Design a protein around this ligand. Sequence first.
Ligand SMILES: O=c1c(NCc2ccccn2)c(-c2ccc(N3CCOCC3)cc2)c1=O
Lengths: 235, 81, 81, 81, 81, 81, 81, 81, 81, 81, 40, 41
Amino acid sequence: AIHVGHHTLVFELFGMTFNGDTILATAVTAVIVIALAFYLRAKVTSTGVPSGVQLFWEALTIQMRQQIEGSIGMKIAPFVLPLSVTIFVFILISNWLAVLPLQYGGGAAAELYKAPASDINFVLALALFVFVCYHAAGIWRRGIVGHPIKVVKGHVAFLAPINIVEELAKPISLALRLFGNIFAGGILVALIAMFPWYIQWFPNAVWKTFDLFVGLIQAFIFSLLTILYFSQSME
Amino acid sequence: PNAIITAGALIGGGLIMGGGAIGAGIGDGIAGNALISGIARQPEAQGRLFTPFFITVGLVEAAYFINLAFMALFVFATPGL
Amino acid sequence: PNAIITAGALIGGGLIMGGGAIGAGIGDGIAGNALISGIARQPEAQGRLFTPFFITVGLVEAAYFINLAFMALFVFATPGL
Amino acid sequence: PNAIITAGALIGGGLIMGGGAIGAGIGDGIAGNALISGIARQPEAQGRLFTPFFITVGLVEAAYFINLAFMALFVFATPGL
Amino acid sequence: PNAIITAGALIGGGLIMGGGAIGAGIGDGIAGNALISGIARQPEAQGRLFTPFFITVGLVEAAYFINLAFMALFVFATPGL
Amino acid sequence: PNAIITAGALIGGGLIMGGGAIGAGIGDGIAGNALISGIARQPEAQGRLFTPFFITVGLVEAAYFINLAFMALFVFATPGL
Amino acid sequence: PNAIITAGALIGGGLIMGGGAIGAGIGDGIAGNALISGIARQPEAQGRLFTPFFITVGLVEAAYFINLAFMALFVFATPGL
Amino acid sequence: PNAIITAGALIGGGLIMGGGAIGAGIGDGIAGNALISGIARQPEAQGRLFTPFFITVGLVEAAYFINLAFMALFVFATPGL
Amino acid sequence: PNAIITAGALIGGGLIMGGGAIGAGIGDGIAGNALISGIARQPEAQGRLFTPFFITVGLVEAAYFINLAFMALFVFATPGL
Amino acid sequence: PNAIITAGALIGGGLIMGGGAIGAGIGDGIAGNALISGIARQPEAQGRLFTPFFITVGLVEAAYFINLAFMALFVFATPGL
Amino acid sequence: MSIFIGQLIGFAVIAFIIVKWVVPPVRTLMRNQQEAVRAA
Amino acid sequence: FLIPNGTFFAVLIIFLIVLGVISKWVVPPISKVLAEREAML
Ligand SMILES: O=c1c(NCc2ccccn2)c(-c2ccc(N3CCOCC3)cc2)c1=O
């Protein structure tokens, strides 16, 4: 049978419970991202032919700057560029790492590395950080008094009740879209694990490719919706 | 008593996902129809249409995946059990 | 007694959320179709089309949210339970 | 007896709200599609267009809100209880 | 006996009213799409498109309201018992 | 026995009416969309377009009204009692 | 037992007619949208447009009427009774 | 036991043919809308368009009739039972 | 015990084939609408349009046939007995 | 108890796949409509239109397969059993 | 083990797919970008 | 499953650390590289 939750390495500290497996997966993706960043630093050059990681970073930064400038120029929001990029890779590397052959049989199926986005804590951390950050940006640009006023007013004043709710919806959905996309997958690949290996091999290949596709799409959508939220909250 | 509630929760979650999948599939098909038509009309649109497109998908998927979240509550954490 | 009421409430909430998701996904896809087509026809429209768009999206998702609220009134709270 | 009637009322209200939300979301998306397309094709007609738009939405939402009115009556008044 | 009949009547009335809501909302949205687009293409047609529009809406509303009546006949009155 | 058949008949008649209403509303909206678009394009086409229109509606509403009669058969004089 | 079988047959026939009515109404509306649009565009082509129209209708209505026939089998013959 | 299985088979077949009818009617209506729009555009093309139109109608009717055969399996040769 | 499971499996299979037929019919009609339209505007385009068509149909029909297989599961190899 | 839960899980999975099939088929058809129309308008654009198409498909099919997952969860790994 | 073998075969299949159809194009793009930088 | 716990913070800090490393040693160097590319032509 399938299980939901059942996190491993769970511990308790400071009166709070922590999912050890989720933290470990987040740390693994974070250290991979940091290794990529430091390899760029060690091998970044403008006077010579770029490295592979340099090309990847240039492409991602150019894309994110293109989305930012098309909605809110970096003269107003230069800080959302280092954000939108990391949110991408942090999510992307988080999802694609789940494509490694790290699934085995306990007889219940288990995985050494389970995608952090499959945990509500990871997605909520990312989404609420984005929420707080772009609300702070909106407060800065419109003022603590004017920002709530323009948030409630929105584009149409008499639609005020439909505005506030949407503002509270942005984070939740921004999280739930990421979690549901990956959590669901965590069940599919577990269900595929009920097949015998000679039948199990093909469904994992088909789904894994979707997981690559959908993880890339979800990283892109998450980052782009973050940029859009910044564009909206920064006038 | 728990069996009846479990069957009802399964049916409810099935309805949740049926609606979510209908909405997601149809809305994503419509958004992709717009994307494909725009790229056919003006090829370079390739660059600029993935921003509004993935926003639309982002709106279409939300209503789906939120439902999916509320499915997990219905199926795995049945509120009234 | 309460088992039947809880099962009925779960089924009703599933219907609410399925209908809400269908409406939200399909309406958001339809609105994003117009948004994508307009941006394809005129890239500058990128700027001005989000105001009509996000009005639509919001009105379309109102029905989703109100429904969602009442689903929270169905499964967590339960009239007649 | 009251348990069965309450479960039936919950299911009926869920059907009412699911259908109402389907209609509301899809109709609002369709109307906003015309609004967005017109504003893209004729930018100066924005104010000119919000009148026929909010009218149509006002109709669509009306259909929704009537249904909501009834759903409360189903779940809180529950005729025949 | 009256409990089962009343639960069935509530479910049937919910189906009637939800289907009427879907039809009314989607038809009103579709008609409003034509209204808004025509007004976008023709400022003057504003006056003359209200006649084809309210006729269409009159039909779309009619099927809705008839359902409402029958829904009442299902829930307030009960044809069986 | 009669109570179960009555509840089933009420549910079936509700399904009939919901389907008939969805079809009627959406078809009338789709036909009125063409009517409004044609009358916006050509304003003198009104008298010409009411014949194709009322034919379509005549078909659409026909499918609706048939569902009424059978609904009555389901609801009043329920078969198989 | 027939009570249960008769109730199930009534629900099944109601589903058959609901689906048939949805399909008939929506397809007839869609076909009449094309008929009205063509007769607006080409007033002199009505005769050449009604033959494709009544063909299309002759298809969708068939799907309706076939369903209706089977409804009777469910409602009056009740094969499993 | 059979009465329950028979009622379930009847409801399943009702869903089977309801979905078949919805799909057949709407798909045939859309294909006929395309045919009528093409013939209004180019009234001499009536002969050419019947091949794609009949291919589409054949696909839709193949789906519809496979579903009607599976309803027949459900009702007259109920699996299990 | 087995009777209830079989009835539920039959209802599930009826829902699956019904949704599958809706999807197949509507998607095939939508794709054939584009096929017929394109062949109407470009008579010679037939050769190049049957490849994108049968691709998209190939997807849509796939969604149908998958369901068919699983429905056989539900009704012949019904899990959970 | 397990019989009721199994029947409910089967009905829920049937709803899940019905919705998933509707969404996948209709979205694939809508995307294929754009693909066919663009390749008709721009025969040389076919290679460029597959990327927007297979992305769109890749979305809707995903929504399908996710449903296919949670059906297998309901049917083969029935939660709450 | 059976689960591990099955998922490993699936991973191998997807790896082959990406290496034979996804790696070639991306690689080109990287080389063309490097060539453009060198030419500039 | 949907109830958060301490991990919400544990992830957040890690993300912030990444948001630091990228915001200092990735984005500014890449922006400098792109600006120098633009200036070179
Ligand atoms: O994602 C995003 C999403 N909605 C997805 C969703 C969440 C819950 C339920 C259904 N759908 C939105 C969104 C953002 C703003 C908005 N308006 C602002 C202007 O004034 C009207 C309201 C409307 C929508 C996303 O960005």
